[PDB]
Curated annotation (Swiss-Prot), chain A:
GO terms for cellular component: cytosolic small ribosomal subunit. This is Small ribosomal subunit protein eS4. It comes from Thermococcus kodakarensis (strain ATCC BAA-918 / JCM 12380 / KOD1). GO terms for molecular function: RNA binding; rRNA binding; structural constituent of ribosome. Belongs to the eukaryotic ribosomal protein eS4 family. The gene is rps4e. Residues 42-104 form the S4 RNA-binding domain. Part of the 30S ribosomal subunit. Keywords: Ribonucleoprotein, Ribosomal protein, RNA-binding, rRNA-binding. The keyword RNA-binding applies. SUPFAM superfamilies: Alpha-L RNA-binding motif. InterPro entries: Rib_uL2_dom2, Ribosomal_eS4, Ribosomal_eS4_central_region, Ribosomal_eS4_central_sf, Ribosomal_eS4_KOW, Ribosomal_eS4_N, Ribosomal_eS4_N_CS, S4_RNA-bd. It holds the Pfam family RS4NT. GO terms for biological process: translation.
From Swiss-Prot, chain B:
Residues 102-164 form the S4 RNA-binding domain. Belongs to the universal ribosomal protein uS4 family. The keyword Ribosomal protein applies. Keywords: Ribonucleoprotein, Ribosomal protein, RNA-binding, rRNA-binding. Pfam families: Ribosomal_S4 (PF00163), S4 (PF01479). This is Small ribosomal subunit protein uS4. One of the primary rRNA binding proteins, it binds directly to 16S rRNA where it nucleates assembly of the body of the 30S subunit. With S5 and S12 plays an important role in translational accuracy. NCBIfam families: PRK04051.1, uS4_arch. One of its GO terms (biological process) is ribosomal small subunit biogenesis. The gene is rps4. It comes from Thermococcus kodakarensis (strain ATCC BAA-918 / JCM 12380 / KOD1). Disulfide bonds: none annotated. The keyword Membrane does not apply. One of its GO terms (cellular component) is small ribosomal subunit. Part of the 30S ribosomal subunit. Contacts protein S5. The interaction surface between S4 and S5 is involved in control of translational fidelity.
From Swiss-Prot, chain C:
GO terms for cellular component: cytosolic small ribosomal subunit. CDD domains: Ribosomal_S8e. It holds the Pfam family Ribosomal_S8e. GO terms for biological process: maturation of SSU-rRNA from tricistronic rRNA transcript (SSU-rRNA, 5.8S rRNA, LSU-rRNA); translation. The gene is rps8e. GO terms for molecular function: structural constituent of ribosome. This is Small ribosomal subunit protein eS8. Part of the 30S ribosomal subunit. It comes from Thermococcus kodakarensis (strain ATCC BAA-918 / JCM 12380 / KOD1) (Pyrococcus kodakaraensis (strain KOD1)). Signal peptide: none annotated. Keywords: Ribonucleoprotein, Ribosomal protein.
UniProtKB/Swiss-Prot annotation, chain D:
GO terms for cellular component: cytosolic small ribosomal subunit; ribosome. With S4 and S5 plays an important role in translational accuracy. Located at the interface of the 30S and 50S subunits. Belongs to the universal ribosomal protein uS12 family. Part of the 30S ribosomal subunit. The gene is rps12. The lineage of its organism: Archaea, Methanobacteriati, Methanobacteriota, Thermococci, Thermococcales. This is Small ribosomal subunit protein uS12. It comes from Thermococcus kodakarensis (strain ATCC BAA-918 / JCM 12380 / KOD1). The chain holds residues 50 to 145 of 147 of the full protein. Keywords: Ribonucleoprotein, Ribosomal protein, RNA-binding, rRNA-binding.
Length: 241, 174, 125, 96
RNA sequence: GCCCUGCAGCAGGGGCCAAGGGUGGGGGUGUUCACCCAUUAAAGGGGAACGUGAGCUGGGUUUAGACCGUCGUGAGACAGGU
RNA sequence: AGCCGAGGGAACUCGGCAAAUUGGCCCCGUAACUUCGGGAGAAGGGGUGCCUGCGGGUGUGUAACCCGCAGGUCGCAGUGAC
RNA sequence: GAGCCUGGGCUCCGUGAGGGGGGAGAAGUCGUAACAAGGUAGCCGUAGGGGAACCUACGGCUCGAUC
RNA sequence: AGUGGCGAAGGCGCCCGGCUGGAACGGGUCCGACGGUGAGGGACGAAGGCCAGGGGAGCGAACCGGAUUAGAUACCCGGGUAG
RNA sequence: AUUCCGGUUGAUCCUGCCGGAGGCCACUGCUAUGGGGGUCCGACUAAGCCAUGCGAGUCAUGGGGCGCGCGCGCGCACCGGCGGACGGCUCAGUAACACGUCGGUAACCUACCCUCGGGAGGGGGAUAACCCCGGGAAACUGGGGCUAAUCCCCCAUAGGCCUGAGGUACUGGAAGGUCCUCAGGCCGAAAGGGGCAUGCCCGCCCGAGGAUGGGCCGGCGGCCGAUUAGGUAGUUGGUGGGGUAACGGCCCACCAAGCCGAAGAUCGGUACGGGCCAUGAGAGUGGGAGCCCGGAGAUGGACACUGAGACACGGGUCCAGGCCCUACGGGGCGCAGCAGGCGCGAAACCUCCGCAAUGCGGGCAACCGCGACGGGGGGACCCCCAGUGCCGUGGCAGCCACGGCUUUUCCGGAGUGUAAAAAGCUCCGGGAAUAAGGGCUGGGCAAGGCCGGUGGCAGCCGCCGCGGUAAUACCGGCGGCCCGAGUGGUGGCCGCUAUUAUUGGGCCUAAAGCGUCCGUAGCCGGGCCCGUAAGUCCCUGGCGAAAUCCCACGGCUCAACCGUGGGGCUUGCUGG
């Protein structure tokens, strides 16, 4: 019987969001707790080794990681268990390479190459709000991170808006609201990786979440949940998809 | 629960001692130079699988249905059992002799590289026959349509010389 | 040991057979019978599930009496009319809901001393 | 199953047949129960003796039961002291 | 304590002297004897008014009550049982 | 005519004769068999003093008779003898 | 709150003087009840009787032959 | 006296009088789907048998007799108890 | 292949059962050349007992100190820190919110990890190693002296918790929640340490949140038994409290009389649950050891300490039952971990090599450790591809003589391969030589009317039936047929079986209508109109892990196998 928490993970039990061979071996890297969830993230060693192919074993990957040759959100990361997730940026400055992490229409995560200019911005989705001592407002974002704001400007930040921020120094620019003409990118569900504009919102009673309708530029309509609709622009995108 | 076990790819008859089946299988075994009944039975099973797929797909409505239809027809054209302008009803007229004609032993005989089917089997198994570029040693390989013209003798093989005694004895037939 | 985890009978009235041991999470502890003191106050400290802390009162001398937002620290005389058990008034045992005399008058206890370490009471009108 | 021989006997064949069928009583080693077993072959009873260990199978019959013209017998001898009766009767092996 | 032996020893069998001491406990039965158990050095047999009721007991037996079986016409009897 | 007797417990005797054991009240729990009325108090088990208090029933009742519970304490023993 | 002892309930197994019927098995003894109107037509139900198949009485059925 | 009739079935035959149940026919009469089957449960139910009380002609299990028979615990005959 | 055949008669048609003929699993007889892949091998009886060796460690950049060489460098142990609660084994118990699925916690905990906002002030102490002296058969262990810390303690400040009165800034579907102000009180932090260097690396404490992992609750769903019919007495609820991390008869005091049940309670039997598997045309029947997710247990049973987490397989205490060492005073152990052994049985392997790959813990890192994992050894475990010669002439009826050829396989060797090996792959030399059996032979059912022996004996036989002196049915010889590195025997499941029948059976005479009626639940119910929209139908959102199943493409010679993608499966739940 189990007397405590788990520390291993088998390959047949790994999430579906990964590009991994499940029968080659028995063991997989269990990620460490961190910003994103388990169903929405992949460790760094798999990126270094199986996606880009800069190493064939794990010793080599650990060795490159322990020398600051790879960044995530403008920060150095030496832990091969750190979970990388959606809207995050992987940067190798020794090769001039910058990738943005996004899902497919299938539900798996990939690497979309971008430029050095767009590598310095990261969008965030406001997921909740709190009042903390000193009478200040704390925004709880979608990667599990947090931001502080003054009381005077509380009405400008709500629980589904999007905020663009310089990544390392973490300064805000270009808030984006949730309205009936905003651009959207779906992150989970059956309609993942689709994109379009908002049309209508719908609420329901006693615990059931809110729904939203969207129109793609071919003219077709589709519904999904409101917490799955990432806002990235007003009329056109601000990042590359 | 119970886990997976690998299963046979050939079927046996329901009764072992019926005169008609015995006679037919005897004739086929003799005229195609097979070693056992397993080979005959597994070719027959291939046929039956094709035939069941056709019977299922026929009159099934959707998108995966037509996808699978086209897949089946293209697979058959590639194997060499159907022409291009074919339809799903041309499958049910196929027989086992075609599957038996699509194997290396028979092709090596019909091409003039061997005097007999047994000689062709020996050549294949000893490694004197080449496909497009390769050495294959399995007389039941089910040659494709684009390879039937790339079948020759291997560079390292005595038969690859035009003056070999046995190769001359082989060309003496034609 | 105080198990405090599950019942060995179904509502229908049938019997149940424990399929596993008594876990440690499920356990309980023995009660603090907070008494009126004579010389001092007594407090115990207890480590708990997640590495946390509880404070037990065993003997009490002082209470915080509230009358409309203004608090005073006074003493505790005889206990009166505990509506939860007959013997508590006699033994002078303090619980939530108990009525106590102080230098001022009668007051009702609004706290749980076996969980908090203090006796907070509201004065009667 | 396995057991030890105690008694060698002969049984009458049912009607309308006339013959003696050779059998032995066998005391099992699992449970100690005594059963009866038929010895197949021409002369299979001479390759057997008391206190020999012998292995016991079903004889083959309707509903796992008596077969042909010897009812009352459900079992059959297969091996004698870890050798096979077929071989002992054909003459290819010997009983240690 | 001794003698003969078909007494090698351990023992057995048969006989002579010897009456100082010992020879017990339990099971069914009213029993005496007889039978049985476990021990023991061995667990002898007899007499004394079948020693001993002005010493005890009171199971058996032979009164007066009653039951069964047999015998008898019957009243009734039984060295037959309760 | 009566009281106590270590260790064993019917070895006593025709026979457990005589003596001893149990013993009041409350609660729990009680077989075979049965003429379904009984057996049955079957059997078997736990409790029981004094003090300080709290409640209930009838009643106008700090009159009277009855019924439940907690805590404290003493003794080898609380239907303490009868 | 283990273990130990004690009583009760439920349940599985082994055994026991003697007796009961069942099923098989070459050839035995006594009868001759059922199939033909089987030599008293057969059979259901209830009751009584007899070495045994069986026999009688009351009520029924035809799955009973002859005219 | 019927190959007939009434009754849920078992079963019901002299005549007259009284009480009572159900069906068919005829019907521009009344209500307006109130119906079918029915686990479990209930009511009726030949003969024979039992309990309690009466009665007892004929027939007649058991029983007893005479015959027939190798025998006859039976068929046949004469008597007879329950019923 | 949506299938039939033999058997009751002198002969016939029926019913109905027995057998044959197909597949999968376990044991087993005879026989056996070679490779590849794979989730195979003490599960069934004994969750029975275990000799030996291994299965959990790491940090010297936390601290003081000893030794060996030139303050520096190497090595050992000690204190201290994190981990040892994962992984690995098994199927006893359990008919249960244990499992599956949908939801919930506004009723809760969380060390390692991420983000943000803030802090590191002032004092004290001991004690291992080291030195002296030891005791005890051992296991273990005493006294004195000296010393340090990221060891221990204390003050302060932050902060944590309770209560009362107000304000209404936040989230949310909805505030016993968060924020602001006041008041009365209990508990109460920290290592600016280490390294490089003339600031950078690794770190300590508080708070708000998340992630990871868990605890608790609910609706639906899935065995048999009436020769088990009434059960329950903290039992069902309420008021007030205790206790828990937290709701709760979880426990306590008081008031009531409720709770479950023929739509089968209670009791008894068997049994880890699912994804899955076998079979069948399908409906359906049956099973659930091996791989994954969940649960439970560590000789039986009970109880506790330390820790974020245990009532803790390789840590503790006791009772029972077993065993071992002893100097007889006393001590120690439980393989359902890898191998190995005894015992039980019809029934299951080497006391091997390695941390190179995949992963875990520790560590700034380099790196160390791991019977997990990987790699070989033994085995008729399952699947895929092959071999035991080919050609021509002649003679017979597949064989023999003759003359040539090839080398899969075999014998020997060089490379590559591999952690090291082995095997496998490329090449070279030799040489048709190095390699077929098992069952059957009367009908069912394919194949002998041939020969010798036995003579109602001996024996065969799924069933029918042979054998009593010319035996096509026994035994053997010679021939022949089925499958073929396999072929036969025993037992179990599905199918055969429309012999369990929803699809889809039957009840005058073959098994089978209650003796007949009236009626409770329940099932089935006349025609038109209006309404609702619960069942039913369509469209769409969120869920039903992966492996397994079907198809196509691509990579290992093809294949089996692996990978990319597209579909189903998940017997369904839920929002519009």
């Amino acid at each position: 019987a189990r007397k405590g928490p788990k520390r291993h993970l088998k390959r047949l039990a790994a999430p579906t969001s990964w590009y991994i061979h499940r029968k080659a071996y028995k063991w997989a890297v269990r990620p460490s707790p961190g910003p994103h969830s388990m169903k929405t993230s992949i460790p760094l060693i798999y990126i270094v080794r199986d996606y880009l192919g800069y190493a064939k074993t794990a010793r080599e990957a650990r060795k490159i990681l322990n020398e600051g040759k790879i960044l995530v959100d403008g920060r150095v990361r030496k832990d091969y268990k750190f979970p990388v997730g959606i809207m995050d940026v992987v940067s190798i400055p020794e090769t001039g390479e910058h990738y943005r992490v996004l899902p497919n229409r299938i539900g798996k995560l990939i690497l979309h190459p971008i430029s050095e200019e767009e590598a310095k911005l990261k969008p965030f989705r406001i997921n909740n709000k709190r009042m903390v001592k000193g009478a200040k407002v704390q925004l709880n974002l979608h990667d599990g991170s947090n931001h502080l704001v003054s009381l005077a400007e509380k009405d400008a930040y709500k629980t589904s808006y999007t905020v663009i921020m310089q990544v390392p120094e973490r300064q805000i620019v270009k808030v984006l609201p949730f309205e009936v003409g905003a651009y959207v990118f779906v992150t989970q569900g059956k309609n993942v990786a689709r994109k379009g504009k908002i049309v209508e919102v719908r609420q329901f009673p006693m615990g059931w979440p809110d729904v939203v309708t969207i129109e793609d530029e071919n003219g077709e309509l589709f519904d999904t949940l409101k917490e799955y609709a990432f806002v990235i622009g007003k009329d056109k995108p601000e990042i590359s998809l | 629960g119970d886990p997976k076990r690998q299963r046979k790819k050939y079927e046996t008859p329901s009764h072992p001692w019926i005169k008609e089946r015995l006679d037919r299988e005897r004739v086929l075994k003799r005229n195609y130079a097979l070693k056992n009944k397993k080979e005959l039975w597994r070719h027959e099973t291939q046929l039956k699988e094709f035939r069941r797929r056709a019977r299922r797909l026929l009159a099934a409505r959707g998108k995966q249905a037509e996808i699978e239809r086209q897949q089946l027809l293209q697979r058959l054209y590639r194997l060499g059992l159907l022409p291009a302008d074919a339809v799903l009803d041309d499958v049910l007229s196929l027989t086992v002799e075609d599957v038996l004609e699509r194997r290396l032993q028979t092709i090596v005989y019909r091409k003039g590289l061997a005097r007999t089917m047994k000689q062709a089997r020996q050549l294949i198994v000893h490694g004197h026959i080449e496909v497009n570029g390769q050495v294959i040693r399995s007389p039941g390989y089910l040659v494709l349509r684009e390879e039937e013209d790339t079948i020759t003798y291997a560079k390292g093989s005595p038969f690859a010389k035009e003056g070999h005694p046995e190769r001359m004895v082989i060309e003496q037939a034609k | 040991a105080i198990w405090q985890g599950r019942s060995l009978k179904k509502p229908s009235g049938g019997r149940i057979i424990l399929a596993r041991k008594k876990r440690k999470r499920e356990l309980g502890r023995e009660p603090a019978n907070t008494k009126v003191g004579e010389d001092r106050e007594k407090r115990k400290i207890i480590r708990t599930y997640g590495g946390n802390r509880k404070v037990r009162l065993v003997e009490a001398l002082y209470a915080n009496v509230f009358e409309g937002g203004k608090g005073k620290k006074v003493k505790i005389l005889n206990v009166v009319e505990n509506p939860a058990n007959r013997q508590y008034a006699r033994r002078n045992i303090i619980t939530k809901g108990a009525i106590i005399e102080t230098e001022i008058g009668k007051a009702i206890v609004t706290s749980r001393p076996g969980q908090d370490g203090v006796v907070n009471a509201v004065l009667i009108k | 199953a396995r057991g030890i021989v105690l008694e060698k006997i002969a049984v009458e064949a049912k009607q309308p047949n006339s013959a003696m069928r050779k059998a032995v009583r066998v005391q099992l080693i699992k449970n100690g129960k005594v059963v009866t077993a038929f010895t197949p072959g021409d002369g299979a009873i001479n390759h057997i003796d008391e206190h020999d260990e012998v292995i016991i199978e079903g004889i083959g019959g309707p509903k796992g039961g008596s077969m042909g013209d010897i009812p009352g017998i459900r079992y059959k001898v297969v091996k004698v002291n870890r050798v096979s009766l077929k071989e002992l009767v054909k003459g290819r092996k010997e009983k240690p």
